[PDB]
Motif scaffolding. Structure first.
Motif, PDB file in Angstrom:
ATOM      1  N   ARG A  19       9.789   9.868 -38.340  1.00 32.77           N
ATOM      2  CA  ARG A  19       9.824  11.209 -37.770  1.00 32.77           C
ATOM      3  C   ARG A  19      11.253  11.627 -37.449  1.00 32.77           C
ATOM      4  O   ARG A  19      11.647  12.771 -37.703  1.00 32.77           O
ATOM      5  CB  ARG A  19       8.958  11.265 -36.513  1.00 32.77           C
ATOM      6  CG  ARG A  19       7.464  11.232 -36.811  1.00 32.77           C
ATOM      7  CD  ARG A  19       6.623  11.038 -35.551  1.00 32.77           C
ATOM      8  NE  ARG A  19       5.188  10.932 -35.840  1.00 32.77           N
ATOM      9  CZ  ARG A  19       4.299  10.396 -35.008  1.00 32.77           C
ATOM     10  NH1 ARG A  19       4.680   9.915 -33.829  1.00 32.77           N
ATOM     11  NH2 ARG A  19       3.017  10.346 -35.347  1.00 32.77           N
ATOM     12  N   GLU A  20      12.039  10.717 -36.868  1.00 31.89           N
ATOM     13  CA  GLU A  20      13.459  10.981 -36.663  1.00 31.89           C
ATOM     14  C   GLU A  20      14.166  11.208 -37.994  1.00 31.89           C
ATOM     15  O   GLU A  20      15.061  12.056 -38.092  1.00 31.89           O
ATOM     16  CB  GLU A  20      14.104   9.824 -35.901  1.00 31.89           C
ATOM     17  N   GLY A  21      13.770  10.473 -39.027  1.00 31.25           N
ATOM     18  CA  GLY A  21      14.340  10.653 -40.345  1.00 31.25           C
ATOM     19  C   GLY A  21      15.690  10.020 -40.553  1.00 31.25           C
ATOM     20  O   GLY A  21      16.381  10.380 -41.508  1.00 31.25           O
ATOM     21  N   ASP A  22      16.097   9.093 -39.687  1.00 28.64           N
ATOM     22  CA  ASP A  22      17.383   8.423 -39.843  1.00 28.64           C
ATOM     23  C   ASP A  22      17.270   7.368 -40.938  1.00 28.64           C
ATOM     24  O   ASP A  22      16.527   6.389 -40.799  1.00 28.64           O
ATOM     25  CB  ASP A  22      17.832   7.776 -38.536  1.00 28.64           C
ATOM     26  CG  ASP A  22      19.168   7.045 -38.675  1.00 28.64           C
ATOM     27  OD1 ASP A  22      19.795   7.130 -39.756  1.00 28.64           O
ATOM     28  OD2 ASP A  22      19.592   6.384 -37.702  1.00 28.64           O
ATOM     29  N   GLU A  23      18.020   7.557 -42.020  1.00 27.19           N
ATOM     30  CA  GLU A  23      17.926   6.643 -43.152  1.00 27.19           C
ATOM     31  C   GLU A  23      18.364   5.237 -42.761  1.00 27.19           C
ATOM     32  O   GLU A  23      17.717   4.251 -43.136  1.00 27.19           O
ATOM     33  CB  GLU A  23      18.764   7.186 -44.309  1.00 27.19           C
ATOM     34  CG  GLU A  23      18.633   6.417 -45.604  1.00 27.19           C
ATOM     35  CD  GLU A  23      19.354   7.091 -46.759  1.00 27.19           C
ATOM     36  OE1 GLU A  23      19.660   8.299 -46.653  1.00 27.19           O
ATOM     37  OE2 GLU A  23      19.612   6.408 -47.772  1.00 27.19           O
ATOM     38  N   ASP A  24      19.433   5.123 -41.972  1.00 23.21           N
ATOM     39  CA  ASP A  24      19.964   3.808 -41.630  1.00 23.21           C
ATOM     40  C   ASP A  24      18.983   3.018 -40.777  1.00 23.21           C
ATOM     41  O   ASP A  24      18.838   1.802 -40.964  1.00 23.21           O
ATOM     42  CB  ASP A  24      21.309   3.960 -40.909  1.00 23.21           C
ATOM     43  N   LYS A  25      18.316   3.678 -39.829  1.00 21.62           N
ATOM     44  CA  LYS A  25      17.310   2.996 -39.027  1.00 21.62           C
ATOM     45  C   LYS A  25      16.167   2.514 -39.912  1.00 21.62           C
ATOM     46  O   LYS A  25      15.687   1.388 -39.765  1.00 21.62           O
ATOM     47  CB  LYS A  25      16.753   3.915 -37.940  1.00 21.62           C
ATOM     48  CG  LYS A  25      17.684   4.263 -36.795  1.00 21.62           C
ATOM     49  N   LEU A  26      15.717   3.362 -40.838  1.00 24.77           N
ATOM     50  CA  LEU A  26      14.666   2.953 -41.759  1.00 24.77           C
ATOM     51  C   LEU A  26      15.090   1.736 -42.572  1.00 24.77           C
ATOM     52  O   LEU A  26      14.306   0.793 -42.737  1.00 24.77           O
ATOM     53  CB  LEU A  26      14.302   4.115 -42.679  1.00 24.77           C
ATOM     54  CG  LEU A  26      13.036   3.914 -43.513  1.00 24.77           C
ATOM     55  CD1 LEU A  26      11.844   3.606 -42.625  1.00 24.77           C
ATOM     56  CD2 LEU A  26      12.755   5.132 -44.357  1.00 24.77           C
ATOM     57  N   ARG A  27      16.335   1.724 -43.078  1.00 23.59           N
ATOM     58  CA  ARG A  27      16.809   0.570 -43.831  1.00 23.59           C
ATOM     59  C   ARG A  27      16.708  -0.700 -43.011  1.00 23.59           C
ATOM     60  O   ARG A  27      16.329  -1.748 -43.534  1.00 23.59           O
ATOM     61  CB  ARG A  27      18.265   0.770 -44.292  1.00 23.59           C
ATOM     62  CG  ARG A  27      18.431   1.719 -45.477  1.00 23.59           C
ATOM     63  CD  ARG A  27      19.850   1.719 -46.034  1.00 23.59           C
ATOM     64  N   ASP A  28      17.052  -0.626 -41.722  1.00 24.67           N
ATOM     65  CA  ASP A  28      17.032  -1.779 -40.833  1.00 24.67           C
ATOM     66  C   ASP A  28      15.649  -2.389 -40.699  1.00 24.67           C
ATOM     67  O   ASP A  28      15.532  -3.543 -40.282  1.00 24.67           O
ATOM     68  CB  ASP A  28      17.544  -1.351 -39.452  1.00 24.67           C
ATOM     69  CG  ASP A  28      17.501  -2.478 -38.427  1.00 24.67           C
ATOM     70  OD1 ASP A  28      18.438  -3.312 -38.408  1.00 24.67           O
ATOM     71  OD2 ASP A  28      16.532  -2.526 -37.631  1.00 24.67           O
ATOM     72  N   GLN A  29      14.603  -1.640 -41.023  1.00 23.78           N
ATOM     73  CA  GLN A  29      13.252  -2.149 -40.900  1.00 23.78           C
ATOM     74  C   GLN A  29      12.766  -2.848 -42.152  1.00 23.78           C
ATOM     75  O   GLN A  29      11.669  -3.418 -42.126  1.00 23.78           O
ATOM     76  CB  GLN A  29      12.327  -0.980 -40.547  1.00 23.78           C
ATOM     77  CG  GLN A  29      12.674  -0.264 -39.266  1.00 23.78           C
ATOM     78  CD  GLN A  29      12.660  -1.164 -38.051  1.00 23.78           C
ATOM     79  OE1 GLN A  29      11.802  -2.035 -37.923  1.00 23.78           O
ATOM     80  NE2 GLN A  29      13.621  -0.977 -37.158  1.00 23.78           N
ATOM     81  N   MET A  30      13.557  -2.827 -43.229  1.00 26.05           N
ATOM     82  CA  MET A  30      13.118  -3.275 -44.541  1.00 26.05           C
ATOM     83  C   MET A  30      13.687  -4.624 -44.940  1.00 26.05           C
ATOM     84  O   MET A  30      14.855  -4.927 -44.667  1.00 26.05           O
ATOM     85  CB  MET A  30      13.525  -2.238 -45.590  1.00 26.05           C
ATOM     86  CG  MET A  30      12.719  -0.940 -45.461  1.00 26.05           C
ATOM     87  SD  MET A  30      13.392   0.280 -46.504  1.00 26.05           S
ATOM     88  CE  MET A  30      12.034   1.472 -46.462  1.00 26.05           C
ATOM     89  N   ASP A  31      12.870  -5.417 -45.630  1.00 21.31           N
ATOM     90  CA  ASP A  31      13.384  -6.582 -46.337  1.00 21.31           C
ATOM     91  C   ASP A  31      14.423  -6.118 -47.359  1.00 21.31           C
ATOM     92  O   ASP A  31      14.322  -5.002 -47.884  1.00 21.31           O
ATOM     93  CB  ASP A  31      12.250  -7.319 -47.045  1.00 21.31           C
ATOM     94  CG  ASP A  31      12.660  -8.679 -47.554  1.00 21.31           C
ATOM     95  OD1 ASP A  31      12.544  -9.649 -46.789  1.00 21.31           O
ATOM     96  OD2 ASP A  31      13.044  -8.809 -48.733  1.00 21.31           O
ATOM     97  N   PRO A  32      15.448  -6.941 -47.655  1.00 21.01           N
ATOM     98  CA  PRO A  32      16.404  -6.526 -48.693  1.00 21.01           C
ATOM     99  C   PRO A  32      15.742  -6.276 -50.030  1.00 21.01           C
ATOM    100  O   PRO A  32      16.183  -5.392 -50.781  1.00 21.01           O
ATOM    101  CB  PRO A  32      17.415  -7.704 -48.764  1.00 21.01           C
ATOM    102  CG  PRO A  32      17.338  -8.363 -47.459  1.00 21.01           C
ATOM    103  CD  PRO A  32      15.896  -8.172 -46.961  1.00 21.01           C
ATOM    104  N   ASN A  33      14.690  -7.020 -50.360  1.00 16.47           N
ATOM    105  CA  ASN A  33      13.967  -6.831 -51.612  1.00 16.47           C
ATOM    106  C   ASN A  33      12.632  -6.117 -51.416  1.00 16.47           C
ATOM    107  O   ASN A  33      11.699  -6.367 -52.177  1.00 16.47           O
ATOM    108  CB  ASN A  33      13.750  -8.181 -52.284  1.00 16.47           C
ATOM    109  CG  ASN A  33      15.026  -8.717 -52.905  1.00 16.47           C
ATOM    110  OD1 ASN A  33      15.744  -7.987 -53.550  1.00 16.47           O
ATOM    111  ND2 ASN A  33      15.321  -9.976 -52.668  1.00 16.47           N
TER     112      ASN A  33
END
Length: 115
Positions: A19-33
């Motif tokens: 909802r915030e839409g911050d791409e960097d925060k979303l990346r932080d939640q993801m496995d590298p692969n």
């Protein structure tokens, strides 16, 4: 600090990030692969997936997720549910499955399948 609260907490954190839409925060939640399947399209990798997801979420006037099934054990979490999207007054309900893996006390998205 409730182990049975894991799923609710992950969903809310994720939803609030999107909802915030911050791409960097979303990346932080993801496995590298991380692998993300939105319909027929398939996106590989944290950087690509976060960008792609963050952009599409912008069309959603409202986004929520209703958990239908959960399997959580030994730091591996799978959940299946319905995403409700609202766009310009029109509501759409789409199945979503996500798989999480706990690393260093931190849950990361390994796989996501939308649709």
């Amino acid at each position: 600090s409730d182990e049975n609260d894991t799923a609710r907490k992950i969903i809310k954190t994720l939803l609030d990030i999107m909802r915030e839409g911050d791409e960097d925060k979303l990346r932080d939640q993801m496995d590298p692969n991380v692998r993300a399947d939105v319909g027929d399209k398939t996106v590989h990798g944290r950087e690509h997936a976060a960008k792609f997801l963050a952009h599409i979420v912008k069309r959603a006037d409202h986004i929520s997720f209703t958990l239908k099934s959960l399997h959580n054990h030994n730091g591996r979490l799978r959940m299946q549910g319905e995403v409700r999207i609202v766009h310009n007054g029109r509501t759409e309900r789409v199945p979503l499955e996500m798989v999480f893996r706990k690393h260093n006390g931190k849950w990361l998205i390994e796989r996501m399948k939308y649709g």
